[PDB]
Amino acid sequence: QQKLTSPDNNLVMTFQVDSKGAPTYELTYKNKVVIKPSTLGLELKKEDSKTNLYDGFEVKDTQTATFDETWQPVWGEEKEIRNHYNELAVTLYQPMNDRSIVIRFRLFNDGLGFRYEFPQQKSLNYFVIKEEHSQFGMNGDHIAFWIPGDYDTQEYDYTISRLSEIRGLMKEAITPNSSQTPFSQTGVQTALMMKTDDGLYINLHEAALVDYSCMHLNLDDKNMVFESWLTPDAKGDKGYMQTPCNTPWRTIIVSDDARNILASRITLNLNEPCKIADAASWVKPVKYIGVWWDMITGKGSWAYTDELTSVKLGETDYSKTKPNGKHSANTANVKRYIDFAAAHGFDAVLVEGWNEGWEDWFGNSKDYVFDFVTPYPDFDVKEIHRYAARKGIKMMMHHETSASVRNYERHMDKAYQFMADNGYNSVKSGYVGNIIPRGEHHYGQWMNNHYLYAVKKAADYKIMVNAHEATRPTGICRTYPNLIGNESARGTEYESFGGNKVYHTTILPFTRLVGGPMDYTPGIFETHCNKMNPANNSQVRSTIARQLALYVTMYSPLQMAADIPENYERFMDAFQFIKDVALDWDETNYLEAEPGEYITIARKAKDTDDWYVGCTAGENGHTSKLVFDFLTPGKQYIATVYADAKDADWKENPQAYTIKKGILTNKSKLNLHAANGGGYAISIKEV
Amino acid sequence: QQKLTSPDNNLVMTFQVDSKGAPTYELTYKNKVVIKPSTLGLELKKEDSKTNLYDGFEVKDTQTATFDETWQPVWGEEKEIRNHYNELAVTLYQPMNDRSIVIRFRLFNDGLGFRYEFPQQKSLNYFVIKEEHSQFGMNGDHIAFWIPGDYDTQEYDYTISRLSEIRGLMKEAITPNSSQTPFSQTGVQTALMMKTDDGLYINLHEAALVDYSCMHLNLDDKNMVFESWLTPDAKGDKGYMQTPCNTPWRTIIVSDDARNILASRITLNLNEPCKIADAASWVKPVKYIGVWWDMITGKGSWAYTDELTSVKLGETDYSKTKPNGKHSANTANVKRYIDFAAAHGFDAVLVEGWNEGWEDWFGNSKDYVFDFVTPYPDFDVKEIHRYAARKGIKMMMHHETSASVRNYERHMDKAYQFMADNGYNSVKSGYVGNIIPRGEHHYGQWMNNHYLYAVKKAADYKIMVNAHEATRPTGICRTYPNLIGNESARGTEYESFGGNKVYHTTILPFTRLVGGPMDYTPGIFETHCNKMNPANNSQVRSTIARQLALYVTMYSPLQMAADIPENYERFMDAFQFIKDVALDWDETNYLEAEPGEYITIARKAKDTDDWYVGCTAGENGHTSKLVFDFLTPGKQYIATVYADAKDADWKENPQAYTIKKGILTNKSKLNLHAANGGGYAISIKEV
Ligand SMILES: OC[C@H]1NC[C@H](O)[C@@H](O)[C@@H]1O
Ligand SMILES: OC[C@H]1NC[C@H](O)[C@@H](O)[C@@H]1O
Ligand SMILES: [Ca+2]
Ligand SMILES: [Ca+2]
């Protein structure tokens, strides 16, 4: 039996093979069982004994090591991250197939990562995975914060329930989406967050998802065991491998303090170091607005014309079509956004609907759907470039692919060259619809390769990428820091489609944000969508002060202010917080955190002595007793508090807020109350 | 009921809608039934009554027209082709679905073409084909010359049998291949050739296979009706369509003279005119030798080293590996081939195994299998280029993809740029293995798009393409004349893998060649492969003189002399015919033709007064009584006859030949005998 312990001696992992040679591990934290005895292994597709990569193993060799080094991300929640673990690598020989694998375990003070490694050898070269069988056996019927396991979307509201209740709730939890493939009545996605009856918080996830299919979890709800369930390709297979190769890491992050789940950097720590040598010279955080919410609410259109039943690029002559009078991506309107962005200190303006093809973009399984380079007649690329550059603004490129992936790859070098030629150095991509090639899913090994290919190629052009609908992140930004965002979860757009649950932003930082930032597009001040489009009666489940808080509580180096300029102009005093808030941080302090209920975070803006605080709360609101002892002794600060007014409420009174300005020091304390679906934001600037 | 008749009144096509509103057609030739009443229509994938595009139609309108214009191919069997037909277009309206299609019929003196057309309209825009239901009802249990219906290979020997015998022969007709998907016990490929008891020859095929899935034929052997059977995608669907759009043409070529099947230009006539405006300036025929037969026989290797269990491009350092002593694509060897090519008036030298990756090329479903640009340590790209240039020789590029198609697309512009930068202006591509993306077949709509994308992109680079394993041709060379070849049928390589049937080359011109030329790689003089590789006991099923004949009887603007130079050196007198024979023709006269038995053809070399003749024969040999009245009155010609010796035989005495030189005029006659698996060749040069 092998035993591995954390540097602080609080976690212990024990490993051994059972009497049939099945690799088995368990994990305790402060003498409490976190992972009951659980097996590890894979089943291979038949080309018989060779399909078995799950038992019949003997421990052939073991190697231990300790690692303790600090490194600096290009952008992040703090300036420096420490990577400190004890490691055990176990070489497992399978006599019946004359082949070996290695399982490598890295144990941190805040949890465990493991992966399988497949050395090059005479009897293991090319192989296909039928299923991975990594188990995570739970010690109780925990509370879980989960979304349905699905090969194609993550755009679901979270459910909070016991593990035993998942099966009963799955049908209701799967809401409609134009591309979705659930796989089990007890399947959930990663990162999965849980709260135990004996006071632990446990997060199950993976890190460094490269050259492999995305992992979901399937629950055996009799034994309370989660098991890896990979995403199949068009033929049902779960990964083409060639040695030497490795699986991604699988992680169990655990603490008796929920704040320490947010603090963990295990996911980043398990990714390969930055491979973009000059990254710091060109990768930069971006605060932006955009021509966007018009189309999301239905006020405006992405399409230039309504008169055609379909379009064929390079045949359809848009100069001969009638403008529909709703096309928001027109030069004059874009210039007005550039004006507002420059006036208020934003870095960029996104424009969607700029290019030919939007008439057919949705649900047609169309191959040649966009060319990514040809503008509509009312979008003057060169004039918009020149005007933005003169005003100090960068335009952000939009590459919706409509999930037509061969089409995007064929156009990608020309599309990136077009960006370089026209002053665009960041692009928001998207993959709406069922994947083409047809039969593949959004999160299979094939598409994972695509998303990273797009990122690696972008890096060669010094382009930053934010990909909507892509596989959810697993820390690869460490390796490729030009991946500055994904959506890859249910974002603010769904506040226009019926709403997100009130507690949504009190869960995302414990789940989605583990592995990388989200382009959540916060900042809606007019929360009634019917003021944009009288036919849309959706209401954003937030107060205005909570929207402000999200600039601190939804971490990202890429931050949109998503409302339209005229709405911000109606509340310019509150808007000041969005203008002031930083995007990049030297320190972060998690002040309060309870998943599904509240999150309060203070961050120190990079290369400054200034701090920003946000709190976001769920259905029951939250009372904070803040203590400002993280400020510098002897310094005075000008603090501006943006808070819910008394009786603010996301539903009945969302726009009621107060703003109070005064002096804070490290001796200050403030009592603040977040409303139902409310929150607060504080700027704290050194005098 | 509508009647359409050929210009010469010999053929009549009758069309009507039947009682249930199914469009049906029939065809007669000289008062003999060719096609019995047969239905037309398609079934669509469900998004109920909208799935029906096969009945419930009524005739809304008809238009007739006559077309009679001549055009000139860039390269071909003659200088000018006449396109002369009577047309009927029927507009068919479907009340229950409020939509219309058009079926267009073109009737020539030698057969019928039809296609379906789908106009843009309110109720037919995007749709997916479940099956096409084009019927061809036969009037009898004909003799057919067929290969098994298959979505992935055409590399089968032909079978000659009655239609009623196909079922019982299918199992034995399907021989092993690395990628094959047969679909029916009575499924066959097109072009399908038949001979009827009442003296007709009937060929069933398609033309202009663009943006659509390849058609095979499935035989109802109780009623003798063939029906279109399209190639499914990874999900089983049979084509994504968007109006306005058309199916390919379906063709019935018929005559009571088998020579007239060979003379038909229906397939080319039904393709769109040339879209490469400057094609005449850079597209040109190519006679070549190659570093190739070494590897096909096993004498030499494509791989550089035998040391590695697999390779990772960009990681494996070949300069640190041991040469295997068998790698034929080495500079010195390549220079000896260039020497031979230049000494004997060849245009080009193909080299295979020049680039990194060949250690892994076969059967591994490997994604990143080649980069198409990085040479092995022993292949000096620049020196070979300089040396070839000094000798007036062009190198022919090789792009085997190992069926990894995303990989080839991602590299394609870099690969074509590397060709341009290094003086390569033609490329032989290949698709050996099951297709990646996995789940697709070689002949589905998805891959058909790929092969044409490769050709269209090549045209932008002024590059000519010869693609092995691609979908078999349907006349698209007319539209893109830089498609100078495919294999896409069983070629000479199989003569090294056990042999082709003796009658193979007496069938190919009636089947495979209809739609475009084949890179058959004739010219094997040493027909016992065991002299290349003693472990290889394969024997080419040919005499030497029949190999000479193939330069005339297997038409192609791309002609290999496939043997190694040292073998040609042994038989240099016979090699003279290969040296002399032209590649491109002002006229072709089909002298004798019976499928499966013999084919004799005379052609006039373009821009000359010289003629070349070849005869290829089956198992029984063939006696020819040639009459040279196609020569010019009053001219004398120097004729050289390369013929089988009287005791020649493909098996027992293949290298026995005679060469006779003398004078011919248009009054001359020659009696010649082709041996079993033999033939003869004649050069006829004006004094
Ligand atoms: O690309 C169109 C639309 N697709 C979905 C993306 O999430 C949204 O932000 C974008 O506006
Ligand atoms: O590309 C390797 C090999 N594949 C099959 C092709 O038909 C053959 O000509 C070529 O030599
Ligand atoms: Ca989305
Ligand atoms: Ca081949």
Numbering used by the authors:
A (entry chain B), B (entry chain A): 22 to 68, 87 to 726
From the primary publication:
Here we describe the three-dimensional structure and mechanistic characterization of the enzyme encoded by susB, a GH97 α-glucosidase from B. thetaiotaomicron (BtGH97a). BtGH97a was shown to hydrolyze a range of substrate sizes from maltose to maltoheptaose, and both α-1,4 and α-1,6 linkages. The tertiary structure of BtGH97a reveals three domains; an N-terminal β-super-sandwich domain (residues 1–317), followed by a canonical (β/α)8 barrel (residues 318–636) and a C-terminal β sheet domain (residues 637–738). The three-dimensional structure and kinetic analyses of BtGH97a reveal an unusual calcium ion-dependent catalytic center in which a glutamate residue is poised to activate the nucleophilic water molecule with both general acid and calcium ion assistance to leaving group departure.
The inhibition of BtGH97a using classical α-glycosidase inhibitors yielded Ki values of 59 μM for deoxynojirimycin 1, 59 μM for castanospermine 2, and 108 nM for acarbose 3. The structures of BtGH97a in complex with 1 and 2 were determined at 1.7 and 2.0 Å resolution, respectively. Clear 2Fobs − Fcalc electron density in the active site (of both molecules of the asymmetric unit) allowed facile building of the complexes. Both 1 and 2 are found in a slightly flattened (toward 4E) 4C1 chair conformation. Each of the inhibitors and the surrounding active-site residues superpose perfectly, so only the interactions for BtGH97a in complex with 1 are described. Hydrogen bonds are formed between the hydroxyl group at C6 and Glu439, between the hydroxyl at C4 and Glu391 and Trp331, and between the hydroxyl at C3 and Lys467. The hydroxyl group at the C2 position interacts with the calcium ion and with His507. The ring nitrogen atom of 1 interacts with a water molecule, which is also within hydrogen bonding distance of Glu439 and Glu508, and hence may mimic the catalytic water molecule in an inverting mechanism (described below in light of 1H NMR experiments). The calcium ion assumes an octahedral coordination, with six ligands, as was observed in the native structure. It coordinates the same four glutamate residues (Glu194, Glu508, Glu526, and Glu532), but instead of interacting with an ethylene glycol molecule, it now coordinates the hydroxyl group at C2 of 1 and a water molecule (all at a distance of between 2.3 and 2.5 Å).
